[PDB]
């Protein structure tokens, strides 16, 4: 006999993008759950090898609970689902019906990682509900929107709002960035971060995020400086709606020369004794070491490059230099601001 | 030098479902274009063999123009696109960014028939815009929604609103059904309809729509009579929100016996001299002929079964017996009501 939340629950797939995008929307989902006053089922994060990673393996449940009411996916499946969310009542929630690429619907389980995510917790949907007629959908930005959610999907009939995709803005709104202070790395991640730092990174150290795979270069070469709209996390350095300047290809994709000059500069600025590099592809260790040869310091990376432990290391750095467009860099910026530790971005 | 509409244009893919669903949303799109006061680019309809069928091959442009301002796809590509919609300005419009199954976006051209549709008219998108923050999206149902469309997407910057999917409710709202009176079959279709009738269908004739492929049977066996919500076109026989009765599996998927009894009954009722059958699969010609043997009349079908000419034939029938759940049957019902000719449905 489990006593469940009378207001009910939200559960969702963090089904868009890599970890950067997933954390970016997760901040919004926390706000949305708080605003609706429903318990948030903490997601399994998704990694592409498909691997589901429990929230609690990465971040501390105790800490996130200081923002809003939460349960782990483990608690939800074992303790909550059996008494309030039987298989006959499992409905998925999306904006509008869509054509499968099956009747018109959300297609919550079509493709990867959509299907694997829900299959991980033995969930099949027996119907869809739509929220497009609630003004702003999940924004809660508009008058009567919050109440329409309560009106349209009452907890008795709808104890679980299960979302096909994260019910949150992408990219995240400035108002949710500070929620990052409630994402505290797990003990395992923090131990690993500390071990690496003591083993390889003489203090003070500069940590850098480099983004340079072909997919990334393609997005950067599309930038329109005349319209100058946000791209991914670009507002982190340029302000809301870019009121501070123009997003350039130099900012999105700094050249090897631009990277090396700016690293040498930042090392000089703080009298750094080591450099840490995290990258999606080219860590430029050999080129950076060649550049820092006169300072008698070296650059170090993780092998293999553990995404989560690298974020934690960058969070602990004496100085962080990130890529302004990258949501992965945005995790670091927000942690350093709120979890203020000095940060900088390439080309700004 | 073409003088174009200062208010601009709407173009869309009828990217959901077979022709029934496509016409169902098209009625809504006509209303939406009318409400926004933008010229509607008439779609190419989609058939799965992927084949694009020009609007004007099926329906009369003159007739639809009596509802709202329209141009054919041919006019749009040759006369309009070159002066107001250059490749650099071709943006797609959807509710929210989504994950491709590519950066987050509408993915207007991912899969089939999405990609082939836009490739048919040589359109590639260079960016996405979202409309989820306009209350109700394309509903225009809500106060300030119409004006937010005008405010957010002005014709100067946005001369073409190009939609990834039809910007219309599915299933269609009762308020749009009467718009079907502005869909008048082309001369080619009507000639073919008449030829078949004179050749095979002694008057008066009963026309029947039969739906029975495996995919269909699967949807019908999911019906919940206790919640009794609309399914596809079911409101055509049961009223808005089913205020008239309960949608049953008998209505959705009538048995062979139920079909045969009800056909014999309807033939009796009007002293019918022939039967016409249109089906997605089993036309039951041999079983129906066995049943009508005592009336000395026969059932006839088209070979191969031309979807469009069959709808036109059913529209002209002395009595139509349709499937209440089917949007294909709903085309017939609405034509007979508005284009009132007698209609009936199996199991009601």
UniProtKB/Swiss-Prot annotation, chains A, B:
GO terms for molecular function: peptide-O-fucosyltransferase activity. It is an enzyme of class 2 (transferase). It catalyses: L-seryl-[protein] + GDP-beta-L-fucose = 3-O-(alpha-L-fucosyl)-L-seryl-[protein] + GDP + H(+); L-threonyl-[protein] + GDP-beta-L-fucose = 3-O-(alpha-L-fucosyl)-L-threonyl-[protein] + GDP + H(+). Keywords: Carbohydrate metabolism, Disulfide bond, Endoplasmic reticulum, Fucose metabolism, Glycoprotein, Glycosyltransferase, Manganese, Notch signaling pathway, Signal, Transferase. PANTHER family: GDP-FUCOSE PROTEIN O-FUCOSYLTRANSFERASE 1 (PTHR21420:SF10). Changing residue 21 to A: Reduces enzyme activity by over 90%. Pathway: Protein modification; protein glycosylation. Its EC number is 2.4.1.221. It holds the Pfam family O-FucT. One of its GO terms (biological process) is Notch signaling pathway. It is found in: Endoplasmic reticulum. InterPro entries: GDP-Fuc_O-FucTrfase (IPR019378), POFUT1 (IPR039922). Catalyzes the reaction that attaches fucose through an O-glycosidic linkage to a conserved serine or threonine residue found in the consensus sequence C2-X(4,5)-[S/T]-C3 of EGF domains, where C2 and C3 are the second and third conserved cysteines. Specifically uses GDP-fucose as donor substrate and proper disulfide pairing of the substrate EGF domains is required for fucose transfer. This is GDP-fucose protein O-fucosyltransferase 1.
